[PDB]
């Protein structure tokens, strides 16, 4: 039967799902690891023991234990990222959307969800693979991984909690796709991994980690990169935050063993409640438990690796959105409100700047401020608000990605860079937020195709267009079959991704990025 | 007789000089101090002993001993600043242009020539007061002072050479005008001192020095201010350069006395030849012997004085030219030539930046470079050349003046700010130089009125217009009788000075000046 598939792990029974006046097969909730529950918490993922009988894969699996956003209860604009399924420590599953009739050996795309490494669900509505799978005829897989302390508590030196296990979780799913995507009609030799933000940074972390490279062909990174200031910490800091988390729970901190045992006895929610009390600074765009530069998963510093070419050379298609910072200022910078134009004042701008560059000293803050302030109209609340948006996105997303892109393109075999700057006609967030972090996804996953969603004809068109780029690129290592120029260390060309006639530009945010990538770091270091 | 005047110093016989189809009286070469020759060299000016008989004041006096420019022999564009009279250590004279018939009690304007404190002549063609005096009916006086080591060798602690004597020379002339300008028909209660560059900085130094304030009513400063990076040095540095100068002449450096004696035995030219070998850095826009913050002439640091309001509060009219740096890059930065468009390359830009900010460290140089580089077209030779022009002018002229202006306006009784950005239709210097440092003078002195000079009708008009502003302001403390707005700490309005309809703008070069006046200094200090 088209809905029954036999894998090296056991028989899997999917379900026929309708799509744009048609149907396809979906296998949801396929286990790819042993439940990381019990004494396994914090530990590396064990391979999922094979099962006898048919595994029921017709319904979404539980979501991983994560901090739930309640900043705007009932607000679609925010609840849309919230777990839409019971949360559980038993969440290591994957979902596959396979065209009908079942392919033989077609392109495979593996989606890695974001969420700051502390949240995320593959089961999210915006992650419904059925539209991409059907329209582009690809076998779409969406994995899951442990987020928060559950997947990133890093007590280096210890085997009970080495950290990075959330990354290992992504890899084991990648390992499972390599081993079983064939029986689903997918070509395990043409698998593209892609993710947004935390997923995009994850994707790039797989490009760098020696133990992950062989498990995929090419990669797509959306608003995220491995070298993002928030995507990783040192083992020292990771150890620092792990102990501090134990402190928050009145744990025996006399030994890693003592510490881990305590944390393992705590209910999941117990850890999620104090999870935020461990950051070292008052900051925006920073999360407690993220990947650690352990020396294992990451042989050396990410910078040295990018420099020495120590990483998987292949084709990469990546980009950023126009207003990456907006989402983060709305949640933690004073002066920003969801229901107001959020015009910012000097005092609030200075407060934002401070929250945005936590590691910066005074001279550094002065540097940032001077760089984004129009001293001929410094009291402009819209300029102050916008400049603060740019500061957060440039420093946390746009510039770190421009570094990686320029570092990679030197040894890579093909780079394609886009700048998504289109605002959904039906966005529910305030307009001052603009093209919000994570709002290109719906187009990538072709949501603008479902009439019930109220998108404009142009948006459906842009979605289709973007969706073809992703797939076509996944399939051929090139987005093209109007030509989206290749990015070269020389010309640095990139294109705009919106409902308007393609346009090509060069040096995406050089000025601001030369400051973020070269000057500031040199300054902060000198001082 | 209209050409004979009796002063407290002796009888002075002038000469009737023709002007724009008319005539006026001129008394040139009136001594105002005892010749600073002999053991008097380096010493403070002594009052000129009164003379019996009539002093012949119908011809220009000698020029002070200064380094002569031979960078472009015979080139009018440069020789026009060169001494047009025998140089001599006996150069302390002043010239007065008095209208005919002789006034009774009319406005007095005293011109202080520039020349980096190492050169300058009141007898220069562009300093011919006859046009201003005649047209505006003012009694125009132009003094002289000792430049170079002769007027600025600073061996603090010693009375033989305390330094700043060149400033004292200007003051003694001011003292002589206060005491004798009446017998010439000038009102010693309405005397405005004005000068360009070194003279403009001098002017402001008289506004700050307690012992100079009472000797004049208001002041006009053109492309120069007291706080310019090159207008003064510390006594330590002044002592450093004095000894180094002795070293250059194989002098006994065992004691200030030993040192001064040696330097006094040397012929003037002996000192001018090695004068440049004493700068502490490889630099542009820096001169060996300049005013010292001695604690006498300047009670405290110029910054503290400007901050505490410790200075003469009155009306000031000041401004800058568009391309102040151009003249200095043409003479010392690699890549600049008088006969080429001087398109600069990255390597030469970086070399310019280095020469422009000598005291800057690496981080500082990186700061400057990032601030003036268009990283989307960084190889543009015209942008590189222009950006380097701005760096030199902004840092050495425009920004230091914007500091002073903003500091003064807080305690002053009237500030008028202009931005002269008109290029003489008959300029002989290359066009890449633009509105060159010191090229507003000819308009201020109404040269565009003399047909033989080939100026356009508009330029003669602009000259006349500017000349009325200066005089009208000198006379009333206001340039106006189309209204040139007053500059206020709040609005910071200033106007453009060119042949086009007056336009008012605000915050003259804020961006670049916030960097030069606040950020860079904070950085250089932090690092
Ligand atoms: C660094 O990126 C993020 C940090 C935190 C969050 C998100 C992030 O990226 C956004 C889009 C997508 O990746 C998932 C969640 C995000 C939007 C919802 N908020 C509440 C959580
Ligand atoms: C800091 O200003 C200067 C430093 C050196 C020189 C001049 C300066 O200002 C110029 C205009 C006027 O003030 C007199 C001389 C100048 C033009 C001729 N050169 C050769 C000497």
Curated annotation (Swiss-Prot), chains A, B:
Keyword line: Cell membrane, Disulfide bond, Glycoprotein, GPI-anchor, Hydrolase, Lipoprotein, Membrane, Neurotransmitter degradation, Serine esterase, Signal, Synapse
Effect of residue 437 to Q: Loss of activity
Annotated consequence of substituting residue 197 to V: Loss of activity
Source organism superkingdom: Eukaryota
Enzyme type, top EC level: hydrolase
Record's keyword annotation contains Isomerase: no
Catalytic activity: acetylcholine + H2O = choline + acetate + H(+)
Known tissue expression: Found in the synapses and to a lower extent in extrajunctional areas of muscle and nerve, and on erythrocyte membranes.
Disulfide-bond pairs as recorded: 64-91, 251-262, 399-513
GO molecular function term, any single one: acetylcholinesterase activity
Glycosylation sites: 56, 413, 454, 525
GO cellular component term, pick one: extracellular space
EC number: 3.1.1.7
CDD domains: Esterase_lipase
Transmembrane portions of the chain: none
Modifications after synthesis and translation: An interchain disulfide bond is present in what becomes position 593 of the T isoform.
InterPro entries attached to this UniProt entry: AB_hydrolase_fold, AChE-related_enzymes, Acylcholinesterase_fish/snake, CarbesteraseB, Carboxylesterase_B_AS, Carboxylesterase_B_CS, Cholinesterase
Activity regulation behaviour: Inhibited by substrate concentrations above 0.5 mM.
Any Pfam family matching the protein: COesterase
Active-site positions on this chain: 197, 324, 437
Record's function text: Terminates signal transduction at the neuromuscular junction by rapid hydrolysis of the acetylcholine released into the synaptic cleft. May be involved in cell-cell interactions.
UniProt record similarity statement: Belongs to the type-B carboxylesterase/lipase family.
SUBUNIT field: Isoform H form is a homodimer; the asymmetric form is a disulfide-bonded oligomer composed of a collagenic subunit (Q) and a variable number of T catalytic subunits.
Protein name: Acetylcholinesterase
């Amino acid at each position: 039967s088209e809905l029954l598939v036999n894998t090296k792990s056991g028989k899997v029974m999917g379900t026929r799902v309708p799509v744009l006046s048609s149907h396809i097969s979906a296998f949801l909730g396929i286990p790819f690891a042993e439940p990381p529950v019990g004494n396994m918490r914090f530990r590396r993922p064990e391979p999922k023991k094979p099962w006898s009988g048919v595994w029921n894969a017709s319904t979404y699996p539980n979501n991983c234990q994560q901090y739930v956003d309640e900043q705007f209860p009932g607000f679609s604009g925010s609840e849309m990222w919230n777990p839409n399924r019971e949360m559980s420590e038993d969440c290591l599953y994957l979902n596959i959307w396979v065209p009908s009739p079942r392919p033989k050996s077609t392109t495979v795309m593996v989606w890695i969800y974001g969420g700051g490494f502390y949240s995320g669900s593959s089961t999210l509505d915006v992650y419904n693979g059925k539209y991409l799978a059907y329209t582009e005829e690809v076998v779409l897989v969406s994995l899951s991984y442990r987020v928060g302390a559950f997947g990133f508590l890093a007590l280096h030196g210890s085997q009970e909690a080495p950290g990075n296990v959330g990354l290992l979780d992504q890899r084991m799913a990648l390992q499972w796709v390599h081993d079983n995507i064939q029986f689903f009609g997918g070509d395990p030799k043409t698998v593209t991994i892609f993710g947004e933000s935390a997923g995009g940074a994850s994707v790039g972390m797989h490009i760098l980690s020696p133990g992950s490279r062989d498990l995929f062909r090419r990669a797509i990174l959306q608003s995220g990169s491995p070298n993002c200031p928030w995507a990783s910490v040192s083992v020292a800091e990771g150890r620092r935050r792990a102990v501090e988390l134990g402190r928050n729970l009145n744990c025996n901190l006399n030994s890693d063993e003592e510490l881990i045992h305590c944390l393992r006895e705590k209910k999941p929610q117990e850890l999620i409640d104090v999870e935020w009390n461990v950051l070292p600074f008052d900051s925006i765009f920073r999360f407690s438990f993220v990947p650690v530069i352990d020396g294992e998963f990451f042989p050396t510093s990410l910078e040295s690796m990018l420099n020495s070419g120590n990483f998987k050379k292949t084709q990469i298609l990546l980009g950023v959105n126009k207003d990456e910072g907006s989402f983060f200022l709305l949640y933690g910078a004073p002066g920003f409100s969801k229901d107001s134009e959020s015009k910012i004042s000097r005092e609030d701008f200075m407060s934002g700047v401070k929250l945005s560059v936590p590691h910066a000293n005074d001279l550094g803050l002065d540097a940032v401020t001077l760089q984004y302030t129009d001293w001929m109209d410094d009291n402009n609340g819209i300029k102050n608000r916008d400049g603060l948006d740019d500061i957060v996105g440039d420093h946390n997303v746009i510039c770190p990605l421009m570094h990686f892109v320029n570092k990679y393109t030197k040894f890579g075999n093909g780079t394609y860079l886009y700048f998504f700057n289109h605002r959904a006609s039906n966005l529910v967030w305030p307009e001052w937020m603009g093209v919000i972090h994570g709002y290109e996804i719906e187009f990538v996953f072709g949501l603008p195709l479902v009439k019930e969603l109220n998108y404009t004809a142009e948006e459906e068109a842009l979605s289709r267009r973007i969706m073809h780029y992703w797939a076509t690129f996944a399939k051929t290592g090139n987005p093209n079959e109007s030509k989206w120029p290749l990015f070269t260390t020389k010309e640095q060309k990139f294109i705009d991704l919106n409902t308007e006639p393609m346009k090509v530009h060069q040096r995406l945010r050089v000025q601001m990025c030369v400051f973020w990538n070269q000057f500031l770091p040199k300054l902060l270091n000198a001082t």
